[PDB]
Design a protein around this ligand. Structure first.
Ligand code: 2TF
Ligand code: S6P
Length: 585
């Protein structure tokens, strides 16, 4: 039948009560699962939200129970991290013709970028040629933009990989896809396995390979699952690797920018730092060297979330400023500035939020006076401005901007990272009455930019901003249980996630859910056979431009009404969320 090719793989909606027993729940990839910790996130207050996401984040470091999926601290995974460290060493020994590519779409792409900078710094600080580079779905502009549509082409990913791998002789490609999902990465990994004399593929993600994405890619014959399965078979001969610990579901279902992006740093910084810091000691990388770093990253979670009450309070002030109709500014220096930008941009697709809503700023890259002349004018009594810096930064360039922002604002708070026994100049740095001082132990660093201190701080800021940005929006009522219902379908994965959210919330068949979705997308056109049979990219291109696609589709289903009837209903309701929630009642 028309459409059967495209929707065949979709699992049927189970009867009420048999979601487990149908085996439906066991085929939801971990990365898409509803986190049971966060069943009631939409009812939690700011302090609970901070507690619940701190807990969700902590699952990255939880160990394997006694029939179950490997985790970060399991022997299989640490052994894989060691062997990969190994192969990275081979390349560092022979820098002529060597390269190390870190590649990903969206937030994996963003994380790849940071890491490639950091490790390129490390080799410069030592007077070696930089061997690292990144690749991101949609070219370099994607690092700092919302561009969710660019991950769906495998030919594109292969193309970018051909550019950068030039006339190199030995290339390590670290394909990062949290969901073992992105067609961008799938093609790179497959290309690598076709030329193993040159390429070494290393796939990173957080699902077991049996849960790796398995629906057809438009411009490629194999699926992510097949690719990953074959890489795993190559791992026995040490010519591909899959690094895939389970880290438990996201506190917001499928929001892999959060735990996923965190775990990607933890995992890859750990393993590359080990490889570097042990080549020059003329010593193989070992589980013990990795563990030191992992445990440090795990302290960093504890350290970070010990500031929870203040994290909640910043959340309440980001949420207030948006409940009214103001903006939120994230102002930071070096790498922490970048991360601020990344958090703000992600809010666009993640929450349906305007680029002004939560904007990041590096001292997007506007200098000291430039910020004071350009941006400072537009600030307002109800806004919120967040300063994010270390004490090693240049605190004259900092205090100035706060002195000034104070006049027009008052809702300021800050995020200051410090070694123990550094002191915050101006005892009236109040200015910031009740800062978020994150104060780090003295650790034993030996490379000269103190890279482990950088990684701690990056990660800790990520956790704070993510929890803040995400929390603020949940308080505003935009999240249904722990799902973002009203998302914008801008790629195939998101189209599938809409469909799943329809099955779950309505309890109705896959055929009806698909019909309602496609009707909602293509309204005012009716469902023809061509539309039914169209590749998923055609539905994405049309949905991408609309508003409220998913809630209109769910209302059509709940009320068993037309798209004309459900648009009328929505428009007659005080708000999308009330329309949906009361229709669910
Ligand atoms: C239809 C469908 C579906 C699945 C899979 N799709 S997907 O893009 O095909 C995909 C993505 C990643 C992966 N590893 N495998 C497949 C991503 C969305 N997804 C999904 C399934 C169920 C659910 C929920 O049922 C929604 O209620 C759950 F509760 F589990 F969150 C959420 C997402
Ligand atoms: O790394 P994945 O699973 O391939 O996902 C890649 C991107 O889709 C993902 O990072 C997305 O942009 C974020 O909005 C997720 O919160």
């Amino acid at each position: 039948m028309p459409g059967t090719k495209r929707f065949q793989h979709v699992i049927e909606t189970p009867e009420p009560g048999k979601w487990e027993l149908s085996g439906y729940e066991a085929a939801v990839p971990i990365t898409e699962k509803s986190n049971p910790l966060t069943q009631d996130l939409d009812k939690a207050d700011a302090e609970n939200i901070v507690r619940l996401l701190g807990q969700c984040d902590a699952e990255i470091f939880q160990e394997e129970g006694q029939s179950t999926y490997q985790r970060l601290y399991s022997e299989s995974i640490l052994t894989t991290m060691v062997q990969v460290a190994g192969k990275v060493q081979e390349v560092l020994k022979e820098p002529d013709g060597g390269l190390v590519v870190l590649s990903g779409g969206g937030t994996s792409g963003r994380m790849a970028f940071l890491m490639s900078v950091s490790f390129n710094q490390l080799m410069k600080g030592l007077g070696q040629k930089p061997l690292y580079t990144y690749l991101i779905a949609g070219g370099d502009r994607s690092v700092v933009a919302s561009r969710e549509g660019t991950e769906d082409s495998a030919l594109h990913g292969i193309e970018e990989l051909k550019k950068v791998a030039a006339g190199k002789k030995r290339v390590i490609v670290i394909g990062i896809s949290v969901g073992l999902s992105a067609p961008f990465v799938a093609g790179q990994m497959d290309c690598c396995m076709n030329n193993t004399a040159v390429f070494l593929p290393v796939l990173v993600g957080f699902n077991p390979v049996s849960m790796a994405r398995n629906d057809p890619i438009e411009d490629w014959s194999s699926t992510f699952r097949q690719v990953a399965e074959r890489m795993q078979k190559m791992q026995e001969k040490q010519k591909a690797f899959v690094l895939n610990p389970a880290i438990g579901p996201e506190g917001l279902s499928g929001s892999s920018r959060m735990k996923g992006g965190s775990a990607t740093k933890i995992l890859l910084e750990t393993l590359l730092l080990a490889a570097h810091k042990t080549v020059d000691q003329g010593i193989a990388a070992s589980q013990r060297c990795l563990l030191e770093i992992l445990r440090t990253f795990e302290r960093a979670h504890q350290v970070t979330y010990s500031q929870s009450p203040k994290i909640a309070t910043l959340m309440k002030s980001v949420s207030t400023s948006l409940e009214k109709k103001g903006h939120v500014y994230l102002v930071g220096w070096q790498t922490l500035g970048i991360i601020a930008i990344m958090d703000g941009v992600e809010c666009i697709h993640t929450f349906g939020a305007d680029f002004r809503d939560v904007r990041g700023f590096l001292i997007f890259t506007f200098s000291q006076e430039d910020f004071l002349t350009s941006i400072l004018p537009s600030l307002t009594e109800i806004d919120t401005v967040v300063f994010i810096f270390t004490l090693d930064d240049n605190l004259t360039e900092v205090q100035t901007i706060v002195e000034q922002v104070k006049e027009k604002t008052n809702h300021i708070q800050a995020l200051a990272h410090s070694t123990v026994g550094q002191t915050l100049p101006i005892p009236l740095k109040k200015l910031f009455p009740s800062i978020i001082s994150i104060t780090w132990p003295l650790l034993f660093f030996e490379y000269e930019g103190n890279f482990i201190q950088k990684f701690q701080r990056e990660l800790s800021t990520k956790w704070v901003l993510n929890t803040v940005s995400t929390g603020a929006h949940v308080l505003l009522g935009k999240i249904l249980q722990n799902h973002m219902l009203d998302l914008r379908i801008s790629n195939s994965k998101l189209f599938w996630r809409a469909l799943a959210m329809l099955q779950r919330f309505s309890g109705q068949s896959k055929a009806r859910c698909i019909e309602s979705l496609l009707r909602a997308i293509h309204f005012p056109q009716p469902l023809s056979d061509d539309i039914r049979a169209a590749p998923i990219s055609c539905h994405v291109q049309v949905a991408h431009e609309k508003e409220q696609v998913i809630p209109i589709a769910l209302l059509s289903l709940l009320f068993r009404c037309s798209i004309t009837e459900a648009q009328a209903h929505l428009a007659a309701a005080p708000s999308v969320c009330e329309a949906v929630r009361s229709a669910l009642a």
